[PDB]
Design a protein around this ligand. Structure first.
Ligand SMILES: N[C@@H](Cc1ccccc1)C(=O)O
Ligand SMILES: N[C@@H](Cc1ccccc1)C(=O)O
Ligand SMILES: N[C@@H](Cc1ccccc1)C(=O)O
Ligand SMILES: N[C@@H](Cc1ccccc1)C(=O)O
Ligand SMILES: [Cl-]
Ligand SMILES: [Cl-]
Ligand SMILES: [Cl-]
Ligand SMILES: [Mn+2]
Ligand SMILES: [Mn+2]
Ligand SMILES: [Mn+2]
Ligand SMILES: [Mn+2]
Lengths: 346, 346, 347, 346
């Protein structure tokens, strides 16, 4: 009898089911209110019912809950100060996808040492998200697979599907059943069609495989997600300017989906240079002042301390993509608030 | 207390676990032998140790197990006839990914009527795959998600990751733990870099989330898959010709991965016209006759009857992509066997 | 230096297929469902004195061969019909007999009779037999020895037992309080009736106990109570089947405020462990029914195709646990009881 | 279709699996050492290698973890003081079995209000047991079913099977795979044969049904438990005296099993008068001074405050069987330590 099963598998270990984490860390009344309200506020921006600017802002990746919470406390002050112009939500992404081998993020490898203590990672991720919502700071994340959402999607006010997965049938099927609004990034080399197609597909009912809250293999039947939109993040060339926004809007209208979109100030739009995020933001600010009718949001990579480092040595500094520091964040947010204040006069 | 969980979910239904199907349909001694041997024979092609041509050939999708088994019976005679020149493996794909709403395939919706009887669909797919191996025909399939392989990957001799998922981090993590060799298709518009990158990534150990054979949420730690290769399937223009093969081989060598590749005669290489598959095969044959050192395999969409139909009215005729019929299949295989006989004799 | 403290004396823990895997392959039919539902109600009617037919739980000590069980049931079915106005005949379908010294663990635990313990196959085979019996028109009965097996096949059971060794057990009484079927509690090994009277009372109330869901996951079960429990007299140090003993049991049952209708086992300790004495017990019960017998609602008999017992399964239709009466004796015993109860019912 | 399934069931609710509790409350290195060594120490008493007296002492039932921990802190001082004569282990029983309807114990109904919050119950039981072991106090309990051991038996140094279940085949099968030594109580009316038979059965390998640590329906194959003994707890008349011990010992030797036994001072030996436990203990002390070679242990129902109460009003006072209070406990342990010192000196 020749072996055919699990030939290239080192180990398959049981995980605690979602319901174990939900039992220890139930969503509170106040967190559930914030999540509910923020999802609705964001849908209003997606569909042009309100003209505040969504701002998804925070670290490239979370590697230290302490720093994240300090960041959120500073950010909360500005979320409140600018609440008539901006809808500020913290970027709480646990991993950056990789081609070359490297750190698998705070959920998969919380101890930053290759031990892959995923039960601890998921618990810590849920704990941080609950703490954020409890302090008044809504959270956003990218969903990389079809199982992690069951552990903490209830605490997420906006979700992303990344460039590497926007075209994936199963990730679009996932998006169609996510409780939050969902942004789809354009493709790595700039392809907008995959994102426009994703919004259309995610609006419909689908089935996909995942687990129950009790941790058992399941088929999920979704209702469709009416609150999806594109995220422009460059690729071919940066696509943040008025010309590119106009062309994307045209193509969105041709497909019969929302022509309100988000612009990422970082990644391929900054050309991996954190010092250009302000320049992109300045360009968007000028669009918002002149007209900017198709913009509903921006994304910004921001941390306590600017730049990046290979090892987690400096407190509050990214170990993935380089981020603007806190002082520059204050400036960038003041810029956008002032420009959108003007746009809202119309 | 505001609701925040499963807001856009119609139903979450626990499935029978893999162990239930494996009890009803254990892999036989004969089927285990065939799978084990075929996986090794393919590894030998991927790594240039044998110069037979792998031929992945069969329906675009399986919608009728009766027709599939009939097809396999005919194909088996040619698998045997050409065993010194070609390694013939049946294409056994249960679904074609969609953008616009349509049939979800024989696993998800086996009754072709929107009932989504997935417990029946998984049973039936396993049964067909066991029957195929038991008759002496190895099987191949595309893995669209991270859970289905637990139900039947033990019966699969060669696996594919399609154009829409080659770039996906989690689908590369999956491939790194698949027991079979894996082909990665180039991107929808022709992007080969994603597939080259994929082979590299898939050769390493990774972690991803799935279920145990008992159906429980799990973390999977893989060993890496040394037997991955790219599949040329066209883009904006076809990419089957010697010039494209030569450049792909140089890029594969530049990345330090295998420079032996597979060419799809169908999909974008046929410009979506089943009558052009033979012309692609004729070009491949000329390449093999002249040199063709970088070719290890071909893919062909073939069925009992040529063409396609919207409803399953005609027996043995595709309801997804149009396929060549049985007579043409005999001719195309004869063509490839003859050309490769000459390549092998050098 | 973590010292080991978990599973120190465990050779292996293996996953079982969940109940729902067996239910998927072998769903209860519409016919079987009807028979189970009506037979349970018919038995309730006997327990509560609303009908004077005699329940007869009859068949092998233990099932070790499905073929012989189905042949047995075909023969018995003819008599179930013939005597339907006097007797309510249900086949005894017990897969195991409990042991103190090591021996065969029964057809569910060790279906292949060779210590391989292929329990997935054993449970499937048990469910298949029970479904086949109900489909042919023969209702089935069984003894429940643990709190998990009922999820696999209790839906096919018309009458359940809790044995002498478990009647006093808190958890087995909790189980009984949630079983869909009527339940008989055997008196204790040495004759103790009090534990069975107490069990009927306890089992009538709502309880909670641990088990598994149909999907096979650890679970707490909250029951509604079982109003259809009764005692089973099966002897002790002395047999307890005679009129004096039945009259005493009924006084104690009424004193406790629970049903004073009971079942009498013709086998085991009432037969003094001798299969050739079952008829004597049945003849004493016949005489009670003719004279009065108002407190008897049923009897239990160990019966097979072929009389006696054997130490290896060589003779087709012959017990490998307790010796049983053969088929010809089974015809005689049932004829005897039907005649006697016809007279009781006419009064 | 007539209904036949779960006719008389109000609800079936899935529990958190053992792995969830094990994650929150892993056994510590120190606790694992205490458990491991205490089990071996008790095995030594069972097999007559050591002549210390095992003392299983504590509340009839635990209804308040705070009182239990306070009790343990006081008892630990005496465990240490008398460690050369007595092996003191705390009685940590969560439930007393009932015939008439009443409180189902701290695991099944921790809130003492009929809410049956068993997930909270199991967590709290495990938490108390871990705390006890961590402070240096080993714990003992009675196992009433075949599932609860999966949640906390790793923390138990000695286990009991009670009078109502000693004869049960499945409870004997359970005992045959318990990691701790096990005492079997004589039957309600005094029957010793069921406990002698239980020791023999439990020494052998058995199979029984339960759940895996992940909570899945399982078959358990045991190795046999060589460390079982009887517990004399009275019958129609008490059975603690020299004459009864002598007779039980003769029957044990006749059966070929250990003739070292435990005597319960409470229950049907005190005839449910807590003030008689000291009288039983005095008789046992006299046996130990004179010969007492078959006695390996005693059991005593003891709490902070003597007596019992129907509602949990007074702190540290039983709501199940009446117990001796702390002062009487000090006296009883001093008495037994002195008497066994003389026994061991022979
Ligand atoms: N629980 C997710 C939806 C989901 C269900 C099941 C699997 C995966 C995702 C949400 O509320 O957004
Ligand atoms: N069982 C798969 C590998 C796998 C394990 C677990 C989850 C998914 C896939 C194979 O043998 O190829
Ligand atoms: N399913 C059983 C009741 C039961 C439920 C859960 C566990 C055990 C028993 C019946 O119908 O009789
Ligand atoms: N885990 C138990 C043994 C056991 C295993 C499985 C089920 C029940 C009990 C122990 O270590 O004592
Ligand atoms: Cl669920
Ligand atoms: Cl009880
Ligand atoms: Cl259930
Ligand atoms: Mn980034
Ligand atoms: Mn196709
Ligand atoms: Mn018997
Ligand atoms: Mn007590």
């Amino acid at each position: 009898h020749y072996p055919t099963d699990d030939i290239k598998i080192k180990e398959v270990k049981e995980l605690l089911p979602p319901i174990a984490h939900l039992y220890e860390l139930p969503i509170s009344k106040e967190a559930s209110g914030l999540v509910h309200r923020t999802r609705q506020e964001i849908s209003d921006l997606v569909h042009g019912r309100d003209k505040r600017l969504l701002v998804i802002i925070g670290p490239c990746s979370i590697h230290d809950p302490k720093a994240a919470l300090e960041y959120a406390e500073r950010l909360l002050k500005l979320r409140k100060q600018y609440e008539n112009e901006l809808l500020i939500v913290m970027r709480v992404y646990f991993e950056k996808p990789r081609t070359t081998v490297g750190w698998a993020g705070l959920i998969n490898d919380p101890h930053l040492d290759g031990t892959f203590d995923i039960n601890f990672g998921l618990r810590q991720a849920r704990s941080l998200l609950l703490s954020l919502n409890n302090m008044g700071m809504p959270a956003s994340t990218e969903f990389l697979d079809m199982i992690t959402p069951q552990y903490y999607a209830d605490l997420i006010s906006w979700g992303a599907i990344g460039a590497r997965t926007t075209e994936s049938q199963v990730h679009r099927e996932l998006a169609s059943g996510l409780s939050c609004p969902v942004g789809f990034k354009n493709g790595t080399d700039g392809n907008l069609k995959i994102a426009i197609d994703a919004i259309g597909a995610a609006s419909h009912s689908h089935h996909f495989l995942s687990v129950t809250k009790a941790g058992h293999s399941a088929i999920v039947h979704t209702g469709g997600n009416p609150d999806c939109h594109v995220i422009l993040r460059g690729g071919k060339e940066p696509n943040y300017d008025a010309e590119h926004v106009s062309e994307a809007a045209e193509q969105l209208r041709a497909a019969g989906v929302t022509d309100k979109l988000m612009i990422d100030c970082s990644h391929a739009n900054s050309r991996k240079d954190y010092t250009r995020q302000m320049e992109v933001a300045q360009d968007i600010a000028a669009q918002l002042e002149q007209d900017g009718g198709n913009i509903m949001g921006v994304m910004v990579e921001s941390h306590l301390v600017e730049g990046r480092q290979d090892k987690p040595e400096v407190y509050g500094k990214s170990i993935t993509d380089a981020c603007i520091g806190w002082g520059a964040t204050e400036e960038l947010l003041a810029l956008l608030a002032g420009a959108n204040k003007k746009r809202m006069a119309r």
